Amino acid sequence: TRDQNGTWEMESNENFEGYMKALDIDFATRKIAVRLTQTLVIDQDGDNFKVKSTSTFWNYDVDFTVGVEFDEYTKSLDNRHVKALVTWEGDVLVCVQKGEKENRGWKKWIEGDKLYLELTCGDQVCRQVFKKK
C-alpha cells in the first residue's frame, strides 16, 4: 500500500555499516551508529511527507513533496550537497539523491504491518524493517 503514515520501530538492520562506510562516515561515528536501533516517524498527506529518524545518537527530520526536486545538505550524516527527488514506482516510494555518490538514495514500502527501507550508496545496500507501533 502507498499509505506510510505512522510511528515505526526498528525490528531489524542489515549492513548499516556498509552503507555508512560507503558514505565515508568517520570510523568513530560509524562504530557507535552501526550498533544502534532506530525509530522513524512519518506524517503523510497527499504528496506531502514529514519524516523523523532517531536513535540515542542522532535525531533528524526531513520534509518533502512527492515529485518536487529539492536540495539537500546532509549535515551530520556525510555533509554533502545532493539534489533529491522522491517519486512512486507502483507502491514503492523511491528517492534518488543526485550527487557525488553513485546509486545513492532509498526505497521504502509497506508489506503487512511493516515498513521496509532499502538505503543505497555505491555498491552497498542496507535493509531495515520497522513495525507499526
Numbering used by the authors: 1 to 133
From the primary publication:
Human cellular retinol binding protein II (hCRBPII) was used as a protein engineering platform to rationally regulate absorptive and emissive properties of a covalently bound fluorogenic dye. We demonstrate the binding of a thio-dapoxyl analog via formation of a protonated imine between an active site lysine residue and the chromophore’s aldehyde. Previously, we showed the utility of human cellular retinol-binding protein II (hCRBPII) mutants as a fluorophoric tag, wherein an active site lysine residue (Q108K) reacts with synthetic aldehydic chromophores, giving rise to the formation of either an imine (Schiff base, SB) or an iminium (protonated SB, PSB). Q108K functions as the active-site lysine and forms a Schiff base with the aldehyde, whereas the K40L mutation is assumed to eliminate interactions between Q108K and Lys40, an interaction that could otherwise impede imine formation, and is also required to promote Schiff base protonation.
However, results were disappointing with most mutations resulting in modest hypsochromic wavelength shifts. Nonetheless, we were able to successfully obtain a crystal structure of M11, which guided further engineering efforts. The tryptophan at position 58 does not sequester the binding pocket; instead, it flips inside, where it makes a cation - π interaction with the diethyl-amino group of TD-1V (3.7 Å). A conserved water network connecting the hydroxyl group of Tyr19 and the thiophene sulfur atom of TD-1V was observed in the M11 crystal structure. The explanation for why only the combination of Y19W with R58W led to the significant change in spectral shift as opposed to the combination of R58H and Y19W is probably due to the nearly 90° rotation of the chromophore trajectory enforced by its interaction with Trp58 for M11.
